[PDB]
Symmetry: D2
Subunit: 345 residues, 4 copies
């Protein structure tokens, strides 16, 4: 197979062969609609096992929907949703959170590496509490792993959870790349979520191997009923649910999801180790997951561009490039990029 | 294969083997996200060919989303969406139209067989026009084929189109079962849509053979831009679009969609012909598509229920039963039901 | 003074001289804004006395705002607001309820004389309860006195309250013409509201004597906090609240409001007694409040129209006219209309 | 009269005696409702004269409503409303703009003295234009005079207008204190609005002398129709409009509004001139309107507080106090404050 030249995002990758085959297997026969079938029930039982707790699960088509739905059930229209200014909900959902929540307001809390600064968060969540002329603190959202591939430690997450419980705020986790942060920390799903104070999680699978299926995992099960209506009302209740369930079931079979995440993180780590010490190349950050950033010589950026590589190079500081690897990124794919970088140095 | 005992709805069926296999074929390699890939472009070209016109296409996860999105772009918040009181948008979307349109109001216009009465429609669309204290006529929605399996004729559709153009109202078609009405009429997609005045269509495929992929087909292309944002904002813009595109492409290959619709309609027609003249059985309607209604003796309803058949029997008048067939309903499946009806008579 | 020829509605009348003078008295000095002044506190204490209970009060600019705000706090976006099809919320608020509630859906329940039929209400409020694809029963709204001048008896109101408590539904009262129904029944404010099960009331004063000031009276005080934010968010929290408070205080001084209502009802009753037995004139209904309907000979309608009288005559059945009297309608004003009717018969 | 000790805001003042008397005069007789009366027509003609142009006028109860309504007609739900982070729409309307616009997003553009920095504005309004995943630039809002009493010059306003026309963005002016900036500049209403590119103005009168009546002045008259429905739908269409019209008519009679603004600005200017050179007192800014800020010795702040003065002293930097004067602030009121400041120094 020729080397895959795309490193723009993990969203360009396909799906593990086991996922597509699960769809084939489940394409025959009849099945109750809207999640009333056995496969769906099986998947829900799997989430309970995986999270070591009775949790409520709602499979939806996209991560944007998962996020907006979660947040809409955790804030009134006159409420505030605290998040990092570089978060996906504040930048790439065309205001989906604002839509689903019926006008809630996002309040940004800056911090290095796309992580909310705990001190600032503590200050913002106590602004004008009770003042009738001001929108009110309602919930907090943190992306795990972050939009730049950094990772909140178990201590940092739990710390945010303190502030949330302290001000009666809900805590949501945008886990579009949940698995990548999970395998980097080597902790349990439970330790990185409810045991740390998370109330709702956007369990991402699409970016880590499936076709199109995300899971809303509710730890604060009292929101289940509201969530059902909100999902349906937003047009996110799939009639032939087995086709979302089949994807996730495969995803959660034989530890496929974790293996896929390990391969993605392993690929970026390989890239960082190969880029360290090359002419006109400075790796930025620790490359904790499947996303790597590095400062490159412009001429080397054009050489990579001319070489047919797909990557972003204008969204941040001058000369800062971003390479994103996926579950399907082979060691070979990475070695091709390294070689082209070397040869272009 | 044993006989399929479910006739509750076509939404219990799986997917044509060609669809799942298309997903397998397209699960490898990389592809631009959010519909920027070649397969998606191919599918769009196919819609233009099929409809004999440059049309704008937006693939979405569900029919509820397709409907709500279409209607939201055709009415202001203070506008009215005219529809039959038995329509899906007025009953089974938990108010999705109201949600997406930011509060538009559904105005029902009754009529036999789930078809809007043209005279009543003409009267309702001219109520308080221009009155500041009243919501205003904005658009009209007709389900083709209807929720009860009846079909609007080309003349009836076009007639509704006159009223719409007359009052500057948009005309939307809920084509959840588009194909079933199309093959029953034997007309062209164009003749049953834009040539008759339709501005926006919810092109249904899920119920006729795919896993989960519907298509918003815009004939009034001036709404394209607004539709992009609305789709994204509602969380309905799938990142790995090839998995929706692959389904639809297969659906629109070798006339699969039409063949599937023919088989579904053929199955119901077989059932109606077998039920005609049996004890305690009166077939209601002409069974124009893949949905059949009949009045049955209660005892025969329990015998079918005890026989393990799945069907609705309480949603309408007393003793009125509904059997729905799908693209996968075999002549054998139908003959089993007929036999059980006979034996239970 | 010449006779007042307008009988279109009570909304054409001005304000009792005591109201305007209260504004004069309170136009000097300084006062805390947004209802934090003494006059406002005084008014709130008056509502508690008048209703013989601790109630929460929120003065707002219009009856449409009072209605929408009340209902928005009693129903989720996916909820249903039951009301008569001829109700103001379903006809003349350009969808304000739909707006404030973020998309809730009005469900009409017909009945003679603009009064919800209890049997139908009982059936509608138990439709698809718990069904995820359907909007849910949330609250009920009854207009007291109704839009046609009829009145719900204490028994009828309480009966609706049973259904509401039975299905955990909130009960709102549109009291745009609260006082007119109150003095017709001769009951206490408490007996016609909370003692009968009402949770929220749109206490109308504008139509009965003030310039522009309505009062949201909450008996279910647990909604107070939410109501504050909703009122502010909707732009209905007046900064110089004393100018709404001054109007209402005057309104509730020396039983002015009741006296005003008595005069309005007395005027319509005088008109009905004078119209009974005249050529080409049939009085319809019992004229329980300040609104009278009668069937008149077309030629007599033009004679009244040519005589300069203002009234509606096309909104109902053929030849059905509506005369509405106000707190300022003198016996003289009524005698002029009667004379012109006589002379035109 | 004893000295008025309140300087918290101009919203604590009452109304010019001419306003209350206008209400008295107009409290008798009958009048068409919802702005269909002669007084209202008269007022509209006055706005056209005052602005030297045919403009559309919509009188509403509050400034928050005026703002939200204006902005809702200038941005789609997926649009951006650019404003200063210290603006009223971004801080004290409990998200009214977000509510009325159905979820539009406020994008802050910082700058000294509550004035949007033109360079930053130019950069922000061209972010992700056309990108489907991002909310889009839609309109800009500037407060004239600003929330801190500063004033945009005719050149600064027009400059913002260039950017707006350049990117097809609407330009709204929050003129809560319109008159104060107008008399400080000595320009014409037209020069400070449409001649500089303003499309919609929240014409503030309440803070400058009336009881409760603001005016939405539309220079982009093509939005009139939409505005009517939006106003009604939001519950802001007063039935007895003459009571808003009477206030504004008085306000715009014998140059009362301008005289009132001159007195307010004159009072603050007197205060600044008296505070200049006193112990432990530093005046901040040029005091261009009716709002003054100064840094005071804590002990002097308690002495003023103990003296019974009402003012804010915690909302900004340490030791920064704010005194706001109104149309009713006499030279005497100001001399009392100066004396107490002196004696407390
Ligand atoms: C990719 C991503 C999402 C989801 O995007 P969709 O295209 O809506 O599925 C959400 N959050 C983050 C941080 C992401 O990287
Ligand atoms: C099945 C159906 C739909 C779509 O329902 P989803 O479950 O949202 O895909 C829409 N309209 C009609 C008439 C239908 O029968
Ligand atoms: C007059 C009236 C209202 C209020 O109308 P506004 O013009 O918004 O104050 C509300 N309900 C009923 C039944 C009315 O008659
Ligand atoms: C006072 C003010 C308003 C209006 O407030 P309301 O209480 O809603 O009338 C709006 N903008 C600014 C800048 C203000 O100072
Ligand atoms: Zn902790
Ligand atoms: Zn025709
Ligand atoms: Zn009872
Ligand atoms: Zn310029």
């Amino acid at each position: 197979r020729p080397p895959a030249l795309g490193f723009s995002s993990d969203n360009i990758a396909g799906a593990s062969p086991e996922v597509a085959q699960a769809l084939v297997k489940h394409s025959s026969g009849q099945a109750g609609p809207y999640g009333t079938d056995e496969l769906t029930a099986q998947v829900k039982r799997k989430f309970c096992e995986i999270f070591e707790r009775d949790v409520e699960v709602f499979l939806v088509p996209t991560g944007t929907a998962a996020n907006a739905l979660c947040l809409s059930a955790m804030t009134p229209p006159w409420g505030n949703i605290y998040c990092h200014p570089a978060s996906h909900i504040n930048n790439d959902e065309c205001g989906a959170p604002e839509f689903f929540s019926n006008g809630a307001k996002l309040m940004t809390v800056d911090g290095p590496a796309a992580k909310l600064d705990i001190v600032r968060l503590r200050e913002r969540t106590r602004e004008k509490v009770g003042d009738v002329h001001t929108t009110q603190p309602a919930c907090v959202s943190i992306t795990q792993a972050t939009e730049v591939g950094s990772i909140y430690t178990l201590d940092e997450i739990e710390a945010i959870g303190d502030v949330c419980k302290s001000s009666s705020l809900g805590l949501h986790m945008d886990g579009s790349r949940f698995a990548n942060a999970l395998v980097s920390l080597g902790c349990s799903p439970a330790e990185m979520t409810w045991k740390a104070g998370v109330d709702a999680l956007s369990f991402g699978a699409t970016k880590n191997g499936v076709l199109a299926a995300e899971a809303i995992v509710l730890f604060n099960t009292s929101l289940a009923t509201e969530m059902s209506y909100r999902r349906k009302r937003a047009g996110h209740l799939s009639s032939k649910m087995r086709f979302l369930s089949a994807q996730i079931d495969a995803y959660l079979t034989d530890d496929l999801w974790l293996r896929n995440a390990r391969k993605a993180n392993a690929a970026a780590q390989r890239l960082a180790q190969g880029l360290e010490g090359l002419g006109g190349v400075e790796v930025l950050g620790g490359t904790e997951a499947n996303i790597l950033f590095c400062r490159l010589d412009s001429a080397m950026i054009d050489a990579l561009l001319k070489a047919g590589f797909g990557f972003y190079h204008d969204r941040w500081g001058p000369n800062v490039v971003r390479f994103v690897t996926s579950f399907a990124t082979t060691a070979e794919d990475v070695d091709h990029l390294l070689n082209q970088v070397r040869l272009a140095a």
